[PDB]
């Protein structure tokens, strides 16, 4: 009957809106997580690059000096 | 028109449910992916930190010992 379809429509709209809120929470969380991943990967890439730079600079320096000894 | 609206309504609910299932699979998959990313970044950060720690410890050790040589 008409009444059953109207109330059923009410259920449609309510559950739809609820799912929408769930989607907002989901994508928002994914966004924050991706920021954490980006900053972590970037920070550790930076630390690695600093390590390599230190090793290379100091090893070249030593090569120069003890090279000069002879 | 009553049965047309009932058929319409059933189709609405059906497409809604289908999209819902697709989304659940989507977010679940994204969660698993974030697990893998976290474990990989963590493992490689750990290996990097071990590398730096060992290099620093041994270089300090040699600095000390050959320092004693002088």
């Amino acid at each position: 009957t008409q009444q059953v379809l109207s109330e059923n429509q009410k259920l449609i709209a309510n559950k739809f809106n609820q799912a929408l809120g769930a989607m907002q929470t989901g994508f928002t969380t994914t966004n924050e997580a991706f920021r954490k991943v980006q900053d972590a990967v970037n920070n550790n890439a930076q630390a690695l690059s600093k390590l390599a730079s230190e090793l290379s600079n100091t090893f070249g320096a030593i090569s120069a000096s003890i090279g000069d000894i002879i | 028109t009553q049965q047309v609206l009932s058929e319409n309504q059933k189709l609405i609910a059906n497409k809604f449910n289908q999209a819902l299932g697709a989304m659940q699979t989507g977010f679940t998959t994204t969660n698993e992916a974030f697990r893998k990313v976290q474990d990989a970044v963590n493992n490689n950060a750990q290996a990097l930190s071990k590398l730096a720690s060992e290099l620093s410890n041994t270089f300090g050790a040699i600095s000390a010992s050959i320092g004693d040589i002088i």
């Binding site: 559950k15 739809f16 969380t29 994914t30 630390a47 | 009932s6 977010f27 976290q38």
Partner: peptide, 30 residues
């Protein structure tokens, strides 16, 4: 200068959102 990565809270947020989605299924009721 070396940092770790913790997404456990975010992953639980995703679990909860997926639960709301599971709780958003439209029953026929006719």
């Amino acid at each position: 200068n070396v940092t770790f990565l913790d997404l456990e809270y975010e992953m639980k947020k995703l679990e909860e959102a997926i639960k709301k989605l599971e709780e958003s299924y439209i029953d026929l009721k006719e």
